Amino acid sequence: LDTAQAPYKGSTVIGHALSKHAGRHPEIWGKVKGSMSGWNEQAMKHFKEIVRAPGEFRPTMNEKGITFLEKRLIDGRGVRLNLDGTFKGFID
């Protein structure tokens, strides 16, 4: 949670991630509203939901040879972690 909730440019790494994802896909994430201060909590809610939902994380390598742990839900939301378990980003 320290990587995800690290203060960064008015919000947190995870708050900014939700902001961009809800901005392009509000149907998947729901619209983000209110102060930048609130983004982190709304993003942590999604994070915890994705973690508790059925399905599994899977090690997944991309075309550039970088590997991540990824859990993608049937509802379109997903989380990508670095191999050390730190938060990388949301995925859809």
Q: What is the 3-state secondary structure (H, E, C) of 58-89?
A: EEEECCCCCEEEEEECCCCCEEEEECCCCEEE
Helix segments in 7-74, DSSP class H = 13-24, 26-29, 36-52
Q: Which run of H or of E encompasses 7?
A: strand 7-8
d(CA 11, CA 85): 21
Cβ contacts of 4 within 8 Å, gap of 6 or more: 12, 13, 14, 43, 44, 47, 86, 87
CB 80 within 8 A of CB 90: yes
Domain boundaries, the chain: 1-92
Structure's resolution in angstroms? 1.8
Q: How was this structure determined?
A: X-ray
